[PDB]
Amino acid sequence: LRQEAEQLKNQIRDARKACADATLSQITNNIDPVGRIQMRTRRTLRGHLAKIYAMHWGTDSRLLVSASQDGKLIIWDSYTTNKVHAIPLRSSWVMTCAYAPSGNYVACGGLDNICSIYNLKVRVSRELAGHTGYLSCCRFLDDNQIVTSSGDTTCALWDIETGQQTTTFTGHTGDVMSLSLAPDTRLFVSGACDASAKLWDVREGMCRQTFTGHESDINAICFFPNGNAFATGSDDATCRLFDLRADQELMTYSHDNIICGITSVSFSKSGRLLLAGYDDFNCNVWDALKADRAGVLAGHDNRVSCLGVTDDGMAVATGSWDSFLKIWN
Amino acid sequence: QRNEEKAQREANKKIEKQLQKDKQVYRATHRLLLLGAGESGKSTIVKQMRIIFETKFQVDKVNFHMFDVGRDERRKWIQCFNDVTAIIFVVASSSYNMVIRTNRLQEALNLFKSIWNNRWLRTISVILFLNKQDLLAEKVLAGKSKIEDYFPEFARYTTPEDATPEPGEDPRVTRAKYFIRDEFLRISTASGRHYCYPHFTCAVDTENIRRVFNDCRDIIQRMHLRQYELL
Amino acid sequence: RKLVEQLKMEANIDRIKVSKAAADLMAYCEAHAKEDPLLTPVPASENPFR
Amino acid sequence: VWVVGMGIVMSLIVLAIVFGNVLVITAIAKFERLQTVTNYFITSLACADLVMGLAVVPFGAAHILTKTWTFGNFWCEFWTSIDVLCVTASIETLCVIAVDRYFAITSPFKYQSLLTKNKARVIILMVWIVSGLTSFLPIQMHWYRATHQEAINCYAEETCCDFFTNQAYAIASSIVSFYVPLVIMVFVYSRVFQEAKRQLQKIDKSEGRHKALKTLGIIMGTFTLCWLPFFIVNIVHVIQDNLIRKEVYILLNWIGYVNSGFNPLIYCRSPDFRIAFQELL
Numbered sequence: 001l002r003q004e005a006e007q008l009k010n011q012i013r014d015a016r017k018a019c020a021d022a023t024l025s026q027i028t029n030n031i032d033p034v035g036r037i038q039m040r041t042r043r044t045l046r047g048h049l050a051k052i053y054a055m056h057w058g059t060d061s062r063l064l065v066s067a068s069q070d071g072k073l074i075i076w077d078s079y080t081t082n083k084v085h086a087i088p089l090r091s092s093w094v095m096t097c098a099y100a101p102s103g104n105y106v107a108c109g110g111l112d113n114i115c116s117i118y119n120l121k122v123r124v125s126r127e128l129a130g131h132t133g134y135l136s137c138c139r140f141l142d143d144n145q146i147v148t149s150s151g152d153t154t155c156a157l158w159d160i161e162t163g164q165q166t167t168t169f170t171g172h173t174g175d176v177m178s179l180s181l182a183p184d185t186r187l188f189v190s191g192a193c194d195a196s197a198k199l200w201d202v203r204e205g206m207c208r209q210t211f212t213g214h215e216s217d218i219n220a221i222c223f224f225p226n227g228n229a230f231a232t233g234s235d236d237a238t239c240r241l242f243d244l245r246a247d248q249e250l251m252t253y254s255h256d257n258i259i260c261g262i263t264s265v266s267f268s269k270s271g272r273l274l275l276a277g278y279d280d281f282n283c284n285v286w287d288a289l290k291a292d293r294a295g296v297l298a299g300h301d302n303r304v305s306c307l308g309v310t311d312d313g314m315a316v317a318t319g320s321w322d323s324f325l326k327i328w329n
Numbered sequence: 330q331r332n333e334e335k336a337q338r339e340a341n342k343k344i345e346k347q348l349q350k351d352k353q354v355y356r357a358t359h360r361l362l363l364l365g366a367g368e369s370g371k372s373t374i375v376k377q378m379r380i381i382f383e384t385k386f387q388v389d390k391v392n393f394h395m396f397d398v399g400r401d402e403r404r405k406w407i408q409c410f411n412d413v414t415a416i417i418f419v420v421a422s423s424s425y426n427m428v429i430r431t432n433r434l435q436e437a438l439n440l441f442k443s444i445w446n447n448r449w450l451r452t453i454s455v456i457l458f459l460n461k462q463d464l465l466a467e468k469v470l471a472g473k474s475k476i477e478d479y480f481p482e483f484a485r486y487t488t489p490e491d492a493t494p495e496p497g498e499d500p501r502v503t504r505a506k507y508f509i510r511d512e513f514l515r516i517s518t519a520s521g522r523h524y525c526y527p528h529f530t531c532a533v534d535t536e537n538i539r540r541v542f543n544d545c546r547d548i549i550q551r552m553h554l555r556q557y558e559l560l
Numbered sequence: 561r562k563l564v565e566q567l568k569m570e571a572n573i574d575r576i577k578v579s580k581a582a583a584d585l586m587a588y589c590e591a592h593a594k595e596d597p598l599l600t601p602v603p604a605s606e607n608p609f610r
Numbered sequence: 611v612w613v614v615g616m617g618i619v620m621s622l623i624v625l626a627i628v629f630g631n632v633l634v635i636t637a638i639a640k641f642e643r644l645q646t647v648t649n650y651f652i653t654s655l656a657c658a659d660l661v662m663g664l665a666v667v668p669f670g671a672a673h674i675l676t677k678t679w680t681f682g683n684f685w686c687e688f689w690t691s692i693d694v695l696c697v698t699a700s701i702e703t704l705c706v707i708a709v710d711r712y713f714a715i716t717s718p719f720k721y722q723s724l725l726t727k728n729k730a731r732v733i734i735l736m737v738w739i740v741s742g743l744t745s746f747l748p749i750q751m752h753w754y755r756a757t758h759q760e761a762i763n764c765y766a767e768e769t770c771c772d773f774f775t776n777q778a779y780a781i782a783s784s785i786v787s788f789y790v791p792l793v794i795m796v797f798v799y800s801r802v803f804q805e806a807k808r809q810l811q812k813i814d815k816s817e818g819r820h821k822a823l824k825t826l827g828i829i830m831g832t833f834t835l836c837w838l839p840f841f842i843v844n845i846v847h848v849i850q851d852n853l854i855r856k857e858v859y860i861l862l863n864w865i866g867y868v869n870s871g872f873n874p875l876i877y878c879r880s881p882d883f884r885i886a887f888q889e890l891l
């Protein structure tokens with residue numbers, strides 16, 4: 001029974017150990033440091049009532065979407081600070097939000113177990129339901145497909161018109177809390193309450209790889225722009241960068257001073273900077289190749305809950321529990 | 330041209346006015362949470378209060394919202410409820426003998442320990458309800474399951490003379506109920522931002538709404554007093 | 561159950577030396593470094609927010 | 611020697627008032643987390659204390675040290691008006707803060723709807739309007755001047771400029787500025803202390819197994835022992851008496867002045883205020 005599983009685990013551990021010739025730090029020790037980075041709050045939105053939970057930049061580098069515990073989903077224009085739209089949610093709690101690349105649809109879902117989707121040309125076009133538990137994160141593959149992460153330890157791939165789960169990516173111990181998409185639509189990964197963070201293929205529907213190798217409670221995942229690597233934030237103080245081709249770890253971003261975990265992780269456009277929000281009121285940035293902190297961002301009144309870097313790389317927007325979204329450049 | 334900017338500013342002004350109205354409507358509404366076991370009888374308390382499931386009731390022109398999260402052993406949605414005035418906790422005081430393949434009451438005590446010593450909700454009080462008081466009285470009077478069989482602390486436990494009991498006409502059920510209350514009280518006191526408010530209630534009783542109203546009022550008063558440093 | 565089959569499928573996969581992957585990531589970061597406005601200097605006129 | 615020593619004390623008082631009130635105003639304005647319903651009243655009190663400490667304390671010190679007033683008669687009237695306005699506004703804002711505290715404690719459910727940003731702004735505007743009326747209207751219109759020959763000679767004199775007032779204006783200014791706020795403050799703080807004692811008794815009974823007295827004591831002490839003697843001497847000297855010398859009157863007035871510098875270090879003792887001050891400095 002479990003003997004085969006133990007043998008397989010030993011085999012994969014041996015393969016990972018054999019494949020690890022020289023660590024990333026060993027190669028990167030001869031690379032110029034990024035140096036100190038000064039980030040200033042260019043514009044503060046401050047148009048929210050309660051603590052906000054998640055945000056998502058639009059395909060254009062301007063528009064925003066933020067969801068708060070007040071139950072109101074407000075679309076924000078970063079350049080002008082004017083509120084383009086304010087779509088109330090039937091559920092008072094919205095655990096996440098998403099902006100479609102088309103821009104004609106916005107999805108927000110929370111503890112209601114329904115991934116409500118709004119049409120911007122603001123009415124609920126279709127509400128997708130079928131998850132046993134709460135939702136954690138939603139992303140748009142296209143204008144007609146959306147992948148949701150549920151508290152039932154399953155991730156699903158929906159179709160808007162059909163309204164049914166096209167594929168269910170079962171096989172996870174803990175509840176998934178965050179997922180990210182590859183630059184292409186073929187692959188996407190997620191990390192659960194269990195330390196395991198697995199890679200999935202939207203076509204096959206099977207977990208191609210499983211990394212884990214973390215303490216507990218992975219809370220945020222982002223893709224390196226190249227798509228060959230992804231970084232996981234966890235309730236442990238450390239933040240790690242994995243690797244799909246090597247199927248193992250590369251570097252661990254930990255500091256003695258920090259004792260809180262991670263809440264959101266997002267790379268820069270070039271991938272050199274790994275911006276990671278913290279349970280502490282201030283966000284931290286890391287040199288993705290040197291594993292050295294570059295500069296602490298300004299703090300909010302409460303803990304941060306989301307990060308987002310523009311598709312053009314213009315600025316990074318962080319929204320905390322203080323109901324304030326502070327665009328940083 | 331500037332016409333688009335003017336239209337966007339007008340839309341922003343309208344949205345801001347609607348947001349201000351919504352803030353005025355919402356800041357006066359108090360949020361409560363139901364966190365009870367499946368066998369704890371939370372349905373009876375919900376029915377009493379009405380007379381994710383959201384229940385809205387108004388007492389003395391004050392609006393309340395009551396949210397029940399509905400296994401979920403690893404409670405990660407608890408951190409979401411940080412703005413609620415109080416957390417309504419329901420535990421069946423008659424479920425001491427019931428055993429889960431650890432007594433159910435001990436499981437409720439562990440759940441209360443987990444809730445109390447939570448980093449995210451450290452300023453959220455707990456309103457405690459103990460349903461099935463009649464069932465507990467019947468179990469104690471019958472003696473089929475000795476109270477000391479599962480709880481060894483009953484050997485040295487004595488009834489508190491300070492606490493005046495209800496006219497239950499039996500010292501034994503009174504001692505058992507007060508021991509069950511004192512377990513939760515000790516667990517809560519082991520940790521002064523938030524307080525625990527035990528209550529002995531029965532399914533027949535319908536005065537729980539006034540109890541919740543008064544307790545929430547006292548919670549807000551204590552929060553304000555500690556904010557101004559008078560307590 | 562199916563866990564054994566999933567583990568067996570996961571075990572059989574082609575892997576590359578971690579040095580090659582680290583070198584590829586470093587090469588990508590060096591090649592696309594100039595594109596990122598956050599890492600590189602941002603002109604006052606270029607910055608849409610100021 | 612005595613005048614040289616008196617200069618150090620006055621300069622220290624002016625510097626302390628200015629520094630404390632500037633720090634409080636900067637902490638309230640710079641950080642958006644400090645802004646609140648009651649912090650609007652706190653910053654109004656800080657602004658009043660700052661303007662009084664910047665305007666009238668240095669000029670009063672210059673008057674007392676040099677024993678003569680160099681500036682013009684109109685400027686002396688302006689200085690007196692600014693002094694009365696600032697003192698009245700400060701004490702009225704103390705009363706308003708106490709009323710807000712009482713309404714937040716004894717009426718918790720209705721507190722959120724009763725007080726809002728618009729309501730706080732309206733209340734502060736009304737306080738400043740009534741203070742400006744009570745100060746400027748009877749001063750610039752020559753209503754407060756007395757019928758004594760000495761008062762007329764002092765008013766006509768250019769250099770010497772002391773304070774001479776009618777019995778009616780002195781009584782009205784005292785009752786508007788201190789006495790009515792004193793009664794309101796005592797009533798609301800008695801009710802708040804009763805509520806706190808009830809809550810402490812209930813918490814002691816329920817849990818089984820003070821601070822409110824000390825806080826109310828320090829607040830009421832630093833208000834009363836600072837302002838009440840001057841505002842009883844005002845009525846005494848106005849109402850058929852000659853035992854109040856100029857030195858006693860000025861000493862009590864300056865005690866009332868230093869009350870303004872004492873206020874911020876007790877009305878901004880919150881941990882959030884301490885953290886904001888640490889961040890600023």
Ligand SMILES: CN[C@@H]1CCc2c(ccc(O)c2O)[C@H]1O
Binds near residue numbers: 697698780784844863
């Ligand atoms: C500069 N001396 C003035 C004269 C009278 C007066 C003061 C303060 C508050 C009042 O309500 C007053 O009527 C004193 O500060």
